[PDB]
Amino acid sequence: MKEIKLILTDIDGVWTDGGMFYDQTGNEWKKFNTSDSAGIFWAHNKGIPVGILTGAKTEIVRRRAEALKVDYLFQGVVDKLSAAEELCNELGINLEQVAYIGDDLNDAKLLKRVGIAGVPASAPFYIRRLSTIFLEKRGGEGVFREFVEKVLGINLEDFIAV
Amino acid sequence: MKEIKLILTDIDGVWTDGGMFYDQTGNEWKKFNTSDSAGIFWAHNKGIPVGILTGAKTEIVRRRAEALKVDYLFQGVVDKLSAAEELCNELGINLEQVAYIGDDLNDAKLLKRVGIAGVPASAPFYIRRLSTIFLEKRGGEGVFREFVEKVLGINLEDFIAVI
Amino acid sequence: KEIKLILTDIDGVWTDGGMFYDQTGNEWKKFNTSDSAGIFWAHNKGIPVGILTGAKTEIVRRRAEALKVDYLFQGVVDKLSAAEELCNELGINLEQVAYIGDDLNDAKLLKRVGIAGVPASAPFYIRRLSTIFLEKRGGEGVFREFVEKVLGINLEDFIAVIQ
Amino acid sequence: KEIKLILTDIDGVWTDGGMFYDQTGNEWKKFNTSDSAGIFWAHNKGIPVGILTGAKTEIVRRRAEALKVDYLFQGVVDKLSAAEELCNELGINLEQVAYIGDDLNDAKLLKRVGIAGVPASAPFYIRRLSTIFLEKRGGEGVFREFVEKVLGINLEDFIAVIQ
Ligand SMILES: [Mg+2]
Ligand SMILES: [Mg+2]
Ligand SMILES: [Mg+2]
Ligand SMILES: [Mg+2]
Helix, strand or coil: CCCCEECCCCCCCCCCCEEEEEEECCEEEEEHHHHHHHHHHHHCCCCCCCEEECCCCCCCHHHHHHCCCCCEECCCCHHHHHHHHHHHHHCCCHHHHHHECCCCCHHHHHHCCCCEEECCCCCCCHHHHCCCCCCCCCCCHHHHHHHHHHHHHHHHHHHHHC | CCCCCEECCCCCCCCCEEECCCCCCCCCCEEEEHHHHHHHHHHHHHHHEEEEEEECCHHHHHHHHHHHHEEEEEEECCCCHHHHHHHHHHCCCCCHHEEECCCCCHHHHCCCCCCCEEECCCCCCHHHHCCCCCCCCCCCCCCCHHHHHHHHHCHHHHHHCCC | CCEEEEEECCCCCCCCCCCCCCCCCCEEEEHHHHHHHHHHHHHCCCEEEEEEECCCCHHHHHHHHHCCCCEEECCCCCCHHHHHHHHHHHHHCHHHEEEEEEHHHHHHHHHCCCCEEEECCCCHHHHHHHHHCCCCCCCCCCHHHHHHHHCCHHHHHHHHHHH | CCCCEEEEEEEECCCCCCECCCCCCCCEEECCCCCCCHHHHHCCCCCCCCEEECCCHHHHHHHHCCCCCCECCCCCCCCCHHHHHHHHHHHHHHHHEEEECCCHHHHHHCCCCCEEEECCCCCHHHHHHCCCCCCCCCCHHHHHHHHHHHCCCHHHHHHHHCC
16 A cells, blocks of 8 residues: 555545535535545544645635645646646655545546546546546545545554544 | 437436425525536537527526536527427528437427437436437436437547547 | 325425525425426316425425415424315315325325325335335425326326327 | 433434535535434433534524424534533433434444444444444434334334324
8 A cells, every 4th residue: 555645636526426506696505525524534643634626716615625624725726737746846745645536537637647546436437447446435425535544544443543 | 329410408307306496585506517517528529519408597507507608508498399490490400410318398399309319317207218328327417428428429539639 | 096186295205305404594495396297297187286294484385386386285283184174175085185295294194095105215104104106205206206196197198298 | 221311413414414515605404304203202202302513503503493402512522521411410321321423523422322323324433333223324314213213113102193
């Protein structure tokens, strides 16, 4: 199991089922899973920072990232690979030391280049097949939590200890 | 796949799971799936315009349509076949060259007329049986994206080409 | 058997039991658009539909209006009495009523109607009261399913309304 | 095992763990109407119900009020000590308590109560802490399932209440 010094994640399709609610005025909702917050916990327990890369720019994600003590947030990302480089360079780590989870076309380049790639079970096939680990969960089912636990090797003794 | 020059689509039951959210104050919601934006991508990638027909008329659909850069939007449509037939005429295209995806009663006449008919796995049986291709996904699960990829025969080459 | 009136519960039938609350006193319910056909099948035959619910919301008032439901009763704790009172006013007995419900406040009425329906999602003790098999769960079009079975809605009936 | 108090977590038990955030980040939760019957069975058997939660929302307060929950502790930093604190005030032991929760911060309490439940949706490490089998996931009416098993609710009990 590789050495991971950064954990990065997409939001829609990973922390959610891809759901995007719109009301008659064009306001938007998203639905996260409380199970995913434990992903942050295990990460921080092992001394690893967590970053979010998203193409959108919403208070929804800013707040949720704030709720969960996420270390790095990049919104309005036009090129997720560029986003991860920048952050890696700033952290002084290489892409090989990154575990990233994404679910769609704009996640492909970065997924083909990270140390560990995860893709939820809900995702398109040609993205799915880029996953270097088996994830059973679908987007919004707690797959970010599943991703982190597997990447970090969280066992029973890990659970007991906390 | 037969040759398609226009992809048409219903909303409720296709882009959503049929869900209609009502609150106490007169507001309404729909739940879309980001997954389906890639159906628009692929269509435009293959030079194919996308049109939306819906019986209802909500700002909910108008805004979503603009976000996804949909080419044609027709709301308040009571006769969807009549709507499809007029848009075909303006485009100078035939109905056999149209791919339509729908899920309910008011979609049935048009489904029987297009070149490729798609119906989500969640649709009532009397409509599902009209699909001329097999669709595994349910409404709101990315069935629109699945419809577009199949109808256009999007493959791994098309994927390697964009990344 | 000959049905003259369709009655129905809301939460757990027209929805999956989901009750969305925010922080300000507002609420959601998520209905399914394919259920609106259930009303259509009923009205196409000249049969009214009524709603019996123990909650009282502007949500259901709005949805019932949009759907042109004939009878709406809210804040009902005694559904069996409320149904009989309507039946008396209609000149029918309960043996001519089809009722679909999902919980304890529905138990008495289900044991007494001509045809009782209970969604696949329902608690076992209520599910066993159903006199017809229903495959769908709350919020998945189980009301439409119920209406179609109760009214013997066949492929033949389907071709007719899409003429 | 005789139970004098039932305690429950919210998110992941009364919900599928979904945390809805609106455009400005305000929260909604989806409850299931089926779970209220868990309150009803508790009170039928003369057992008070308590809610423990780390979050503090008006969402939970309104629902608790609506369901006539006996005890409500919010902003709880350690669920076990809050539970200890209430049991001390009521003069009961954790052994006389049944608790259902679903994540890490429930683990310590789950190991202390007389009957522990954990929903089928929960993380493996927490699920194994459950002392009775629960088939339902969070949001599916698993609080109700939990109470009916704990209290040994039989068809006899059901028949008794619908007379
Ligand atoms: Mg995504
Ligand atoms: Mg539709
Ligand atoms: Mg109900
Ligand atoms: Mg919880």
